[PDB]
């Protein structure tokens, strides 16, 4: 009840003017006060023929969304930043396009990063799609293909409370930060997902060292659980070109495209 007054409401207009225009990717901004699921309508847009390059949508609210391979993401009004964007792929080759999300969760975690006051322990990304702040996740991304496009979605906790969404949750307000602005927040977010795209785009190292430089997971003993339900337990080595990971299993190399991760 108290956080509803933490929550005012999205400035489109501002967020246009700070993104549209010369030296920006961005084409198209729009902010909805509510939608069942950002990614579902740009896949919709683009599935009758809209060129979603480039194209920002952002919700308030959203009532029925996505996760990773069926599972859900839950949201209270004005409580996250719930975005999707566009980006045209075909240009790159397929093998490339798991990067793609990577580069998405880097670009969320360097948004917040600094807003903390103390990083406190295990803050940083769990492959392949979680920014972990405090042991609990921060943000989801989600990435679906609609040919020649990806849409990328990303949900991120701005004040949304744990038992609002879910038991391993947190966000920037229950990491301390009293008085989150989300006009600022997404305004840095959507500017470095652009960077963040562009060199995904070129093959930048610079992409894969700086995931390598705030992975969570490489280094330490997981436990992977795989589509399907199978279980693989071992230490995560490395990601590779197509950003699987590479774990190390009792001398034995696992190359894992898809899962879910703990950290041991
Ligand atoms: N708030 C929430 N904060 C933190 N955690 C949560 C939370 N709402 C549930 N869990 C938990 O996360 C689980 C799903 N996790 S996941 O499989 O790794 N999937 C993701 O994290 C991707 C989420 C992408 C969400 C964005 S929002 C804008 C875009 N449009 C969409 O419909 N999807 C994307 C879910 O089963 C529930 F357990």
Known sequence: TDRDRLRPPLDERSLRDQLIGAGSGWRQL????????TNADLLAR???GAD???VVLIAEHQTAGRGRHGRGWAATARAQIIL?????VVDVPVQAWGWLSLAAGLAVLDSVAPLIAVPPAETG??????????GGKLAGILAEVAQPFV?????LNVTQAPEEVDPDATSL???????????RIASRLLRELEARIIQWRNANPQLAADYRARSLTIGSRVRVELPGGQDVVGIAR????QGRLCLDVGGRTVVVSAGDVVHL
């Open 52 to 54: 979603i390059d480039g």
């Open 238 to 241: 490395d990601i590779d070109d």
């Open 46 to 48: 683009a599935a009758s």
């Open 84 to 88: 999707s964007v566009g980006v045209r």
């Open 30 to 37: 729009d902010v909805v006060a509510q939608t069942g699921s």
């Open 125 to 134: 990304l769990k492959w392949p799609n979680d920014v972990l702040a405090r």
């Open 173 to 183: 307000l229950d990491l301390g930060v009293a008085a989150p602005d989300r006009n």
């Open 151 to 155: 849409v990328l979605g990303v949900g």
